[PDB]
Amino acid sequence: HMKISIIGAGSVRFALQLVGDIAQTEELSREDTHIYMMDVHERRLNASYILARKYVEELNSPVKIVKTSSLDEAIDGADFIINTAYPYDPRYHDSGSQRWDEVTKVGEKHGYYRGIDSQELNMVSTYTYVLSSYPDMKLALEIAEKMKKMAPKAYLMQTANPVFEITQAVRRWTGANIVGFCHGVAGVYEVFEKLDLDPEEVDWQVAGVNHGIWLNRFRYRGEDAYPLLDEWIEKKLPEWEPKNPWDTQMSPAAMDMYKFYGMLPIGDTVRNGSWKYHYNLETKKKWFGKFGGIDNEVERPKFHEQLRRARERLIKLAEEVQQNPGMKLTEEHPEIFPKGKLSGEQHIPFINAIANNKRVRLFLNVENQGTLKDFPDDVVMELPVWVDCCGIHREKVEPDLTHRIKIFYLWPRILRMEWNLEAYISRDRKVLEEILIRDPRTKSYEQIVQVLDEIFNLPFNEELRRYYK
Amino acid sequence: HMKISIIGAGSVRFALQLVGDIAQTEELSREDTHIYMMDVHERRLNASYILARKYVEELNSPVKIVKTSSLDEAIDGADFIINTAYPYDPRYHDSGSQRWDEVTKVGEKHGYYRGIDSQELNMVSTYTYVLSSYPDMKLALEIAEKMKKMAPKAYLMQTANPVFEITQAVRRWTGANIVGFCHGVAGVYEVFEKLDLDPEEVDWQVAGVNHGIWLNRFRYRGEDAYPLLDEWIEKKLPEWEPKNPWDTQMSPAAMDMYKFYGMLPIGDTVRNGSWKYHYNLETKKKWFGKFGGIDNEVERPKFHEQLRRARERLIKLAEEVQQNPGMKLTEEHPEIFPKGKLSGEQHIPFINAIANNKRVRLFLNVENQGTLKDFPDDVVMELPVWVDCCGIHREKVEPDLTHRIKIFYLWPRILRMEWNLEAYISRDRKVLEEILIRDPRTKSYEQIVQVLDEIFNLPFNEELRRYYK
Lengths: 469, 469
Ligand SMILES: NC(=O)C1=CN([C@@H]2O[C@H](COP(=O)(O)OP(=O)(O)OC[C@H]3O[C@@H](n4cnc5c(N)ncnc54)[C@H](O)[C@@H]3O)[C@@H](O)[C@H]2O)C=CC1
Ligand SMILES: NC(=O)C1=CN([C@@H]2O[C@H](COP(=O)(O)OP(=O)(O)OC[C@H]3O[C@@H](n4cnc5c(N)ncnc54)[C@H](O)[C@@H]3O)[C@@H](O)[C@H]2O)C=CC1
Prior knowledge:
Two copies of one chain form a homodimer. With about 475 residues, chain A is of the alpha/beta class. The first copy, chain A, folds into two domains: about 1-85 and about 330-360, NAD(P)-binding Rossmann-like Domain (Rossmann fold, 3-Layer(aba) Sandwich); about 85-325 and about 360-469, no CATH class. Chain A is about 45% helix and about 15% strand. The first copy, chain A, is globular, with a radius of gyration of 22 Å. Chain A starts with a strand and ends with a helix. One 1,4-dihydronicotinamide adenine dinucleotide (NAI) binds near residues 8, 11 and 181 of chain B. The PDB classes it as hydrolase. Keywords: hydrolase-oxidoreductase, alpha-glucuronidase activity, carbohydrate metabolism, NAD-binding Rossmann-fold, LDH C-terminal domain-like, hydrolase. It forms a dimeric assembly. Structure of NADH complex of Thermotoga maritima alpha-glucuronidase at 2.15 Angstrom resolution.
């Protein structure tokens, strides 16, 4: 049979997206397709399982849903393993976002605005946890080892962050068949809309690292289309206004980075700028608009609060369908349970390409292997690839990334990845300290020791503490 | 004939060293050897020329000394061109150290301790000037271009700083036959003395970048000798005491870097540490001893004052020999005019190897060419090489540099070199700003603009200002 296992399936809205796409995919919506939903939180797991089955029935799909609390059962014989899990210490927390928010406050308590995990070219909230991302790296490596023995032919589709660090560590240290997934490339489509360009007429390409990708090719009617962006910057940027904290693709920060690097940063890359745009909230609002972006002391906690409420609402919704089995989820909540239209994420298209040879162009985190010849072959890059039955095939990156992107952006970010991996495998707190010694916000060595001490001493970091002892 | 040209021969004590070594080298001390002394300062040039000829006569050497104020005359048909020049604006200064000290004060005025040119892994005073080192890079490139046309077979022996940036820029942008020289490797000999080891019994090697070299091999009696350093750190480091501001090879800073990186930094590399050891003068004194090293607000200006006095003393000494031609410079000032013993620098041994096939092991700045396979072939490294009649031959670097040296030290330093070269060739002040945006001491973007504005506005930076306009 076709076994697709979702690790961390309590991520309900994302689980239902995966389920909905599988049910609305002709080649996968079969009785021979088994979706395994696995999670450590019983309440969330059950809620997801109930909503998933009710959702599948309304879509009239014969795929069978199986829930399990055993990671081994989900991994055993799986064809594809989707890791969207966000570990947490259940003695003190209910989800993973809590540990990152709390340590971030300890960081700011010691003079590190937005926490020590916020660094130059690395501002995306909740991306790394205490630099080395111990609980997240640990789980990914555990799955990889269990996978090599129990599912030798499976693909580990890593979505939990940090995608870059994790995918690199698993590939380098286990040789497991892992691929990192993120749809940050989707930002290009707002560029085309703002410039009044039919996407189908645009010959474009992006490449870089996760949350560090650049519009290296942007052409229209047989010519470079960047002069059209120059015109927009001069005639329409002064009136740009963000629709919500997440709206940053066409922000002053994005264009200032374009002016310097020569290519437009795409997606979360705009969030991952130098400290020039992130010294404080006032600075963020100058460069990202009224909200100050999403990675600040106001919007980040607010967004995480919305997520918690959304979890409970969906839990209670699962109790509603059990009491009222006659309701139609697709009718009363069409947004959360779409019908007909696919989500647009890359996970299921990827599965449909490997399993059913439905060839598709995707943007995935895979080893360089000479694609960006100036970087090592084994470094995991976010590259344009065509996926089919027999492997993943990297496109040629043309034009190549600019000289400034390589020396001022890609390499510093690649080195930070290496710093973080070294901090994990070495189990040496001195590596963590060295990373903060390169941090602009550090004023003294004694400051570094103190912020790390308080972080390590938090009750829910007992495991992390013993790891580095 | 054999034409050896010294560009910047007003560097008298270094010029006399070069002359003394040539006169005391059997194969070079010939009537067919012409030493051309060239400099833009008439007083210093003449003083050096007079002291040089009197010195040669007392050594009973037939080499002829020629002084000239024409760079073209010195370069024309030269076999070896030694660039020890330190440019300066004569309308406001008398030597090059003045412009660096003054801009350093402007930097500290704006909150950049020890000036913007002091950066992590780059604390050596007077190494770079306003990041891009415009006057020094400009002169080196001028010589290289004049050299390709007027002396196609000559070697440009670069000694003026920044050696790394300059040698890289000349090689990459002109293909001139440049080699960078620095004798920082000599620090290893103090290690052996402190550990009671006969140098001739030590199988050792160093490699890295200029002022960024590491004792990668340290063996004694067929075993790794680093356990002998571990013993010294435990039993003799607590009583270590610097003899002078320059004494740092066995300092707490050097050993702390050894503990983290796994190999001992050698020479100026100990000065080029992270900000952990250089936040302020008190911190420097904790890690370097009572003097706080040499790169601080007390010792650096004091050392530069000693140099100025030494220049005048030697100028007046040149007036003495003209009035008293009977005096013996080798007798009344044996230190400044040695006799019998060679200096130990690598410049003349290098010349004697290329010209007379006197094969010797040296440590020179040359393109990697696979020696450190993890780095690009064209990056200029400071490597162990054997020089003879027909080329420079790189030794195998074994053991390889540790993983931490590469990701935490060598690569960040190599990237800074690329930042500085980009800042020079682009003529784009935004590149300078980006470098300071990665500076830990920066608190705001407006601070960056202001410190650069005041630096660019200094009268003796008119040329630099027009360059970046
Ligand atoms: N790659 C991408 O496109 C993006 C990355 N993410 C990442 O995806 C992850 C999940 O994000 P959210 O859904 O918002 O958080 P969430 O808390 O709603 O989902 C995490 C789920 O994983 C469960 N789980 C925790 N530990 C587990 C373990 N050992 N084994 C199995 N299941 C476990 C948790 O109980 C929870 O139900 C996060 O790490 C987040 O950073 C989120 C958005 C974009
Ligand atoms: N590679 C190494 O081992 C070391 C590097 N250095 C570098 O060597 C350089 C010289 O150092 P110092 O002798 O202490 O300074 P210095 O001021 O005593 O010598 C510089 C000489 O170059 C002259 N000169 C200036 N502009 C010239 C031009 N266009 N053309 C020809 N000659 C010119 C100056 O008039 C002066 O006489 C400096 O750049 C210094 O940083 C110094 C010590 C160690």
